[PDB]
Symmetry: C5
Subunit: 311 residues, 5 copies
């Protein structure tokens, strides 16, 4: 139980691969996702080499304790992987074929700027710290990287499970460290978003705009203010349950603009009344009449500006 | 501790059986359910065979470490099953009778399209990866598949516990994998749904429709808008608190239609007043009178269309 | 480590016992209660017999690994018991005296039909699967059953901790299984219930009835509708946090009836106004005057009907 | 190994103590608190006694496996303590000095009757079950009982960590049990309660009382009812998140009283209008004028009665 | 497995270092943060020293069980560290180079007085208890104290990861303790705070101030009270979810002042009406006109006072 010696002065290349079995619990708030997968490792340890003629066997099976296995760890895991060795197979030349089944809650940041049209790239970082005896470098076996066809994330389109084939080798505390990036690309499945979140919220803003075809200040205060309460209550109903993102989101910008529209509508309603009370019903009625077109138009344009601005 | 050798080139047939002891924690949000059950495994290892005359014993009991046991794993489990071996029995011919008790949170998707009248089929996938020495294939022992009569899920009718007898054998990473599906069929209990969710939500809506027997715009704005707030508060009140399904549900469609009805009712109330203010009380009163029948009728039909459309 | 042999063809009687140390985490939603307790087990393994003269000890203490212990398991536990062996003592005859401190989240259904006046019987099921060598049957040593006086459940009166002395012996997967029932009887502590839940909700409904001493439709719409919003907001404030029980509860029936009363009150208010607007202030005022008595009376009787109906 | 033998017929006295290192996660709802602390155990085992002259060492260090250690357990812990042995030191006379570092979630009831001015006594119960060979009794070593100066609980003043020096020795299942009570006294930091909870809630109440300087029934219904909604919404905003305490709290009594005041205020507003409509504006105006003083006075007195009643 | 002996009467110096790999789950409510990092320990054990000539090896690798490793523990961790030894290397002189990978939820208080402009210093306390044989003192190896560049906390600026080089040596339960302070500095990066929390909350407040350009008491009651409900509902929407901080926060002071402004605005509205009803429309209109400037000015100044007062 010591690393295999180098033929020359070459480092030990370990052939990695992750095959996704199950993907679940994608926590948008915590920026985590639980994955249940296979981990395939391969390296050549000539100390384990055998003659298939003399041995009379094609490949020999070993116990993890019996042979030297590289210390492969994950970088962005919450709690260390629940490892279960499935099989260890040494071919006659000494090439070890290691396979384990694991499950891990992965920490991977998410960008909600383009939400709910957002797409995400989920990372799984593999790492190996080079020993005293020799240096270890990770490699990707593209045949052993993939995902089950049943692999799902509710509300997401699982685009691809790939791996940046070139490791990021670097020095950490006077030792070499070889890091591999495994990427899971997903795009949001948002059709229910329009009837469930946008349209209802829109009718609410629209009900406020009916105050442009009314002269009763009592009815108009009730119109714009009550729809504001209705809007806040509606947003309480839908609400994401995630702490505010430090950055400004697309949906967040629209919501901000909606609060601004309720404020401006109150200004109009207030002005309309003050002009009417200050015996200027020419200006009072003209503003109201303008707003009837101004509010829907400006809203429509301001959303076009934002949509363009974010996408 | 190596697989039993084949008589000829035949694969190892492992006879399974899952007997449900307890079923609990069905998370509609997470699409999981925890299950407490028995796992019965059986295979013939002639290396372990004996003469009952010479041995003087009926059946010999072994420790898991002592004999070769196939690596049976579950496909759709969150964290690897809490396994406890109950008994291992080897009959004189070498037939191993393995039984373990386990508990695992099983990831199984749910279809809420027909909610709350929905029925679900819960999957438990058994799998075995074929070794170098020989190929392993799973089989179902229908005598050892069942469930306790005490097995319950609050709010569900546990219909059946059945098993797809024919395994799905396939190749994965150059090795054969035999997969079995165990189905748990459940149907929802929607007794309380009508008085707890549907009826109060309908009363709130009907309160809005009373604005068709009134000419006071102040009282009418108050009627349709306040019921809208009441409706949103009532929906906050029900609190399913499951993130919106990406897809459109039956209940979700009705709710959408309800938001639309509140909007249209505001249009009517607004129009009624504008016609009355624009000295056309013939059209004003006629629309209000029409709506008195139009709103209940269109609602009734639109729900019939949906009910039919979803069921 | 094999069962003790029978003198004649008698089964092994494992005398049991459960002594509650702590009881906590009663989750009404999950139908679970966490219990921290002692487990007392006794059987005769004559293979362990000794002469105290030759031994020099009147009783010998053993490690769990050293001797044969029955495989006792709990039926309705979420995750396998957190077992800690306190003591194993053998008397000269070979009578084993086992004691273990365990803690487990027990799954036991709850009947909320009579809530908040409901009483519950929480179950803890002990089981043992009979082996090939000999059959095992469980018994209750009534002296080693009981509960600490400090044992509490906030908001419940812990009535008793008793055992169904006669085990339920049955056949499961061709083997005998002996099951014991441990019952924990509890009754709820309502009383905060009247000032915290009923009266404030009851006041809100009476505030709606003040619309029977008013003729202003604007003030009456505001009265009955605003109290409806107040009622929903109040129920959001109290709310149980449990998903709807599939069955109709007593409290749930009252709440349903309250929603119905808000609807009927809106009908009255609407009718009163329509009669007054259709120049029939004789009928308008008579209905309002009737309601003044009708609403409180019908409510009082309808609650009496329900109280009687549920209890 | 086996307990030390008694010199005469005396029981083994175990001197126990621990200094709180960290205290965190005080869950008011669950009546639990996580504590991270030291556990110091001491007893004399003359079998381990040595001559410091012959040995040439002052104190010998042992491994837990090597010597006999008493089975000390905690009575009120959720899941069994996370024990880590720091040091075992045996003095020449045979006095063992055991010290472990542990962390455990402790179940200890809380009395919210005087909330938010409440003070609490948190219990940690130590226990030891006496063996067959000899009886074990617990003692407190006051030098080894303490709490870190850094030990904090957010929103609590950590007063004293003391221990009831005299154990509660009792018989349980025919064996002696010695129990020590360690108490953690804390007082609540209620400063932010006045500006955050009591004053905004009261401003809301007073806004309702402005209806005593108004004659408009429409404006008065709006005043008292809308402030009621505002009050419920405000209470939803502040809300503790803890299930209802079965008993009546001080804050709970005030809140009850507030709901009663909103009801009575609606009675006044209703009466005032009915008298005014019944052409009796002498009585109408007199009641309103009375209330202007009656409501603030009765409130002030009723709170004095309660404050006195609870404290 | 006993501490190395001192050359003279010197204590054993253990050179420490913590390298942050991942930082996640910063719970503002619980005052915790999970950290995934490296722990580098170094000391000289001359009992392990060797001749590189005779041995033919530069550095020898040992198993944790084989050699003596100091009992290093963390002070402020929730649950015992998830330790995994990466490498143990002994140089010819006997200098041990220990490296492990750990993950732990660290309890570290937070000061929200200056929230959301607040900055925090996160502590990680290393400790070692001095043994009987010799005294142990901790040291910082500044070369082995860093953080990964990828290390992130969403909504925070990870400024630095430093260590107080001089340990805090003290006596605890008659033994010497050496404690090291590793402090992580983070400044809250909450850009989105103004458009997401402040701006909408202010629009809501200003809507109330429009009641200064109106004489309709019905419309004015509706203005100030409804905006107050809107404000509470808005605050329910943006709710932090953390229990009230015992102390007064900056944001909390502003919110308090906002509740006070809604109260004063109701006083004005009430007074304005009473003066108008008591035939004094000179004073009524003058106060309303004053308020138009008084309310915005006093608000602006009062916020300047607070901003200055807190920062
Ligand atoms: C004319 C008073 C209407 C009133 C009940 C009003 C709207 C101003 C409403 O409709 N809803 C709510 S939640 N608050 C209010 O004050
Ligand atoms: C008219 C004001 C409506 C108030 C709605 C409040 C909803 C709060 C829900 C909070 C759930 C925890
Ligand atoms: Cl890991
Ligand atoms: Cl599994
Ligand atoms: Cl169990
Ligand atoms: Cl314990
Ligand atoms: Cl630690």
């Amino acid at each position: 139980v010591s690393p295999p010696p180098p033929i020359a002065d070459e480092p030990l290349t370990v052939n990695t691969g992750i095959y996704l079995i199950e993907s679940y619990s994608l926590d948008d708030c915590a920026e985590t996702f639980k994955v249940n997968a296979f981990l395939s490792l391969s390296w050549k340890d000539r100390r384990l080499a055998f003659d298939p003629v003399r041995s009379g066997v094609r490949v020999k099976t070993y116990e993890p304790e019996a042979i030297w296995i590289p210390e492969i760890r994950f970088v962005n895991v919450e709690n260390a992987r629940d490892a279960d060795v499935v099989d260890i197979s040494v071919s006659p030349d000494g090439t070890v074929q290691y396979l384990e089944r694991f499950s891990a809650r992965v920490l991977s940041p998410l960008d909600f700027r383009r939400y709910p049209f957002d797409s995400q790239t989920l990372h799984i970082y593999l790492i190996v710290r080079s020993v005293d005896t020799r240096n270890i470098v990770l490699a990707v076996d593209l045949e052993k990287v993939g995902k089950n066809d049943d692999v799902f994330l509710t509300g997401w389109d699982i685009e691809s499970f790939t791996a940046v084939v070139k490791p990021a080798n670097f020095a950490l505390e006077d030792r070499l460290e070889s890091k591999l990036d495994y990427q899971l690309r997903i795009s949001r499945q948002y059709f229910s978003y329009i009837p469930n979140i946008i349209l209802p919220m829109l009718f609410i803003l629209f009900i406020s705009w009916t105050a442009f075809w009314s002269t009763s200040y009592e009815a108009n205060v009730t119109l714009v203010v009550s729809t504001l309460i209705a809007h806040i209550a509606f947003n309480i109903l839908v609400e994401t349950n995630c702490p505010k993102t430090p950055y400004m989101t697309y949906t967040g910008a629209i919501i901000f603009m909606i609060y601004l529209f309720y404020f401006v509508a109150v200004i109009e309603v207030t002005v309309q009344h003050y002009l009417k009370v200050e015996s200027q019903p020419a200006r009072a009625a003209s503003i109201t009449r303008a707003s009837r077109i101004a509010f829907p138009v400006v809203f429509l344009l301001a959303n076009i500006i934002l949509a363009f601005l974010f996408f």
